[PDB]
């Protein structure tokens, strides 16, 4: 039976799923770890004890306990990211889409969802691996991991809540793929891990972490870097927030044992309710529980690891979307609202700058403002709005990614950089938000091929082109077809620093993606703040 697969953990029974006039197998909800419930909350993941009998892998699993966005009730643009299954601490499962007939040893792609490490689901409609698995003949896997305090509460030194447990969930899922994907026709020697936002950061973190390197072949990072300012915290900061969380829940704060015991007795929603109260600054684009630089998962500082070449050397394909800041400005900056063009005043511009660079002194704030202000037309509401979008995006995603790409490329075996600047025609979010972060995913997952989704013919073509770029790269370490008549996506080199735009227009190659702004963020500003 094509829908029955025997693994080292037990037999699983998938389901025949229809996809673009055909069908494929889908093994949904396969457990890869023991439910992190009870005294297991905050602890490292334990492997899923093998089971007797057949595991029903015909339906999606529960989503992990997480903060749910309710800013725009009923709005698809926001709810399309919210959990679409019952939330549960028992959420460490993975889904696999297998081509029919079951392949023998084909390329495997493992998707790691984003969501600032505080949210995310593998079951979202935009993450349906159906189209990519079918169109590209790949075994597509989507894993899950604990988010929020559940996956990142860090009381370093403690065995009960060491921190980084959400990253270990990812690793365990990767371990399970390593050990069993062969039974689904996947080639364990050719596994490409790919993710967006916190998932992209995660991908880079697995490239860095010694304990994860051997579990995959290549990597794809979309709008995420392990070095993003919001993707990790020091062990001191993690401990600080863990205690403050306990303080929010009236916990005995005399010992880690009592803090952790208290936190474990709290219902999931209780931790989620006060989750955001632990942030150190009035800021945007900062999340409470994220990976901690523990000296275990990450041997030393990300920067030193990057400098020394202390990371997995392989091929990587990565990039960003044009407007990486609009989302967090809409949700937290004064003057922005979903239903207006959000033209920003000078007053709100400076308030935004302050929210964007949390612990920057006045001089730092001045450096940012001068850098992003057109003094010939400083009251231009559209320029002030777009200027803020750039500040938030550059600082939080684009420039950190550029720093990582340049550091990596020095030791890597091939880099491919893209700049996705096509706004989906059916995008429900306002126009001012632009090519919003996360809206390239639908193209990566081939949603534009489904006519009912209302995409243009051009968008379907772009989707197919992106999917083939992703799959060909995952399969060969090069997004380009060996000897083809199509425009060639050049390799990013330390010298040339080439990249391509990803849109419905004919491929165009550029160099030094936002160098001007990134020299400011990566070189100048850090030096300024260090001195002051
Ligand atoms: C779960 O597995 C059983 C195996 O007998 C199957 O009959 C059932 O239909 C599956 N659940 C769903 C919702 O299909
Ligand atoms: C990648 O590695 C192979 C073998 O070590 C080498 O021949 C090739 O030149 C490398 N490519 C890049 C872009 O570094
Ligand atoms: C999916 C994506 C997202 C995109 C836009 C808005 C959200 O609230 C979440 N994650 C990765 C950060």
UniProtKB/Swiss-Prot annotation:
UniProt record similarity statement: Belongs to the type-B carboxylesterase/lipase family.
Superkingdom of source: Eukaryota
Function of the molecule: Terminates signal transduction at the neuromuscular junction by rapid hydrolysis of the acetylcholine released into the synaptic cleft. May be involved in cell-cell interactions.
The reaction(s) this protein catalyses: acetylcholine + H2O = choline + acetate + H(+)
Pfam families associated with the record: COesterase (PF00135)
Protein name (record): Acetylcholinesterase
Underlying gene: ache
Subunit structure: Isoform H form is a homodimer; the asymmetric form is a disulfide-bonded oligomer composed of a collagenic subunit (Q) and a variable number of T catalytic subunits.
Effect of residue 196 to Q/D: Decrease in activity
Record organism: Tetronarce californica
Disulfide linkage: 64-91, 251-262, 399-518
Enzyme class: hydrolase
BP-aspect Gene Ontology terms: acetylcholine catabolic process in synaptic cleft; choline metabolic process
Annotated keywords: Cell membrane, Disulfide bond, Glycoprotein, GPI-anchor, Hydrolase, Lipoprotein, Membrane, Neurotransmitter degradation, Serine esterase, Signal, Synapse
GO cellular component: extracellular space; plasma membrane; side of membrane; synapse; synaptic cleft
The EC number(s) this enzyme carries: 3.1.1.7
Single GO MF descriptor: acetylcholinesterase activity
Post-translational modification: An interchain disulfide bond is present in what becomes position 593 of the T isoform.
Catalytic residues identified in the record: 197 (acyl-ester intermediate), 324 (charge relay system), 437 (charge relay system)
Record carries keyword Membrane: yes
Outcome recorded upon mutating residue 197 to V: Loss of activity
